[PDB]
Design a protein around this ligand. Structure first.
Ligand SMILES: C/C1=C2N=C(/C=C3\N/C(=C(/C)C4=N[C@@](C)([C@@H]5N=C1[C@](C)(CCC(=O)O)[C@H]5CC(=O)O)[C@@](C)(CC(N)=O)[C@@H]4CCC(=O)O)[C@@](C)(CC(N)=O)[C@@H]3CCC(=O)O)C(C)(C)[C@@H]/2CCC(=O)O
Length: 384
């Protein structure tokens, strides 16, 4: 039932997640955060009863109100600063197409709650949201806007692909490998996802506002609720979170922090930097000999999984630069320079092996991977 989202359980999860995330930000940077960017998918919030909406609401310092008997959400309440041991944090929400289609009432609740917070009389130190909204509202009025329209424009925090469309709109570009820099991905990303959603707003084109929001962002955030997929067995994670982060860098010239958080255990959510999660997946899956044993008893599908992994590794390197040499080395050593695994791929899927050795040579060229010795570089183009 959509009417009951976010749930009490999802709000506990998202309230705890938000605090661990601010703690972690303060530990990495030595100051309070003022602006996060969040990604929000449909099936994820169905499975958790609205973890991401919850989190975004706790970050801005607002809480759902439920009917005590039916447990439908009937509205929101502002957490007052009396109840806040940390500052409100500004949130910009990149929503997927399916999330747009499945959770419009929750988009409407988020949109309202954030405009409400944006209209309080709090100090800048405590409320960056209000300070941004009023200042940008001022600026649009200076240049000659109707105050009503300034309010609307300065107050959008929800952004996605246009009505009837889906995805991150990078797939054309990235697969063909026709980009000069991050700027090309960021351009395409902004184009596709630059549509605003509000209480009574149905997907206006506002690419300018999205740029203004992404310039403020200090950290990109994504929550994963299950251990069934991982950020390296699908293209979706790098497109959404890697895309956003690439865009902030194109706009600001500095790569924001990225945090890829674990909500698979709702009682204990773990915050991790993207670098840390990539590492966990390489140790626990990609380069895990038990996992590699497994996919060598699946022939074609199995060697596809291998090639795919290096693809998404490659794609994270290009969007965020948060893949190290160690990682590329690990997949080369475990996939190509293990003749057991090489031979398995040559036999059972010669395409996947050429794809693989192509993406590894592109990694050397583009500077993602400086190999252990030049022996490596010869063999890889050789094999292609
Ligand atoms: C994370 C996302 C996901 N979509 C996937 C793959 C699939 N979706 C598919 C498709 C093809 C689609 N995947 C969608 C649902 C996209 N998949 C997503 C997105 C990014 C988000 C989905 C969400 O909001 O949960 C979808 C795009 C969007 O909604 O804007 C989709 C709308 C993409 C598009 N048309 O451009 C489109 C559905 C179209 C339709 O039918 O009418 C497949 C059926 C085929 C494929 N390999 O592309 C596949 C099924 C799972 C598997 O093979 O293991 C997952 C599961 C890896 C992944 C995670 C979701 C989760 O966390 O549970």
């Amino acid at each position: 039932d959509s009417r009951a989202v976010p749930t009490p359980a999802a709000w506990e999860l998202g309230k705890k997640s938000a605090e661990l995330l601010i703690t972690r930000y303060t530990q990495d940077h030595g100051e309070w955060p003022t602006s996060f960017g969040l990604t929000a998918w449909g099936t994820s919030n169905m499975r958790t009863g609205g973890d991401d909406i919850a989190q975004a609401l706790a970050l801005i310092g607002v809480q759902p109100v439920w009917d005590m008997a039916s447990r439908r959400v009937t509205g929101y309440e502002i957490v007052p600063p009396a109840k806040l041991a940390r500052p409100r944090v500004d949130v910009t929400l990149r929503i997927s197409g399916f999330f747009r289609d499945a959770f419009p009432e929750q988009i409407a609740l988020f949109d309202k709650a954030v405009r409400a917070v944006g209209a309080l009389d709090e100090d800048v130190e405590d409320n960056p949201i209000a300070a941004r909204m009023k200042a940008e509202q001022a600026r649009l009025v200076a240049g000659g806007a109707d105050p009503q329209t300034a309010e609307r424009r300065a107050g959008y925090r929800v952004f996605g692909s246009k009505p009837g469309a889906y995805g991150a709109g990078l797939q054309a570009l990235i697969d063909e490998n026709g980009w000069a820099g991050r700027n090309d991905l960021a351009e395409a990303w902004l184009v596709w996802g630059g549509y605003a959603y509000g209480a009574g707003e149905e997907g206006q084109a506002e690419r300018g506002l999205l740029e203004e929001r992404l310039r403020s962002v200090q950290a990109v955030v994504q929550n994963q609720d299950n251990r069934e997929h991982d950020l390296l067995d699908s293209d979706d994670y790098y497109q959404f979170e890697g895309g956003m982060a690439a865009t902030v860098e194109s706009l600001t010239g500095a790569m924001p922090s990225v945090y890829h958080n674990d909500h698979s255990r709702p009682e204990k959510p773990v915050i991790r930097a993207l670098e840390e999660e990539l590492s966990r997946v390489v140790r626990g899956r990609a380069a895990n000999p038990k996992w590699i044993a497994g996919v060598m008893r699946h022939g074609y599908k199995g060697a596809a999984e291998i090639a795919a992994t290096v693809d998404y590794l490659f794609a994270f390197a290009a969007t965020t630069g948060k893949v190290g040499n160690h990682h590329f080395e690990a997949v080369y050593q475990a996939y190509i320079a293990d003749r057991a695994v090489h031979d398995f791929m040559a036999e059972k899927n010669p395409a996947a092996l050429a794809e693989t050795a192509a993406k590894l040579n592109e990694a050397i060229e583009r500077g993602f991977w400086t190999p252990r010795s030049n022996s490596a570089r010869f063999e890889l183009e050789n094999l292609s």
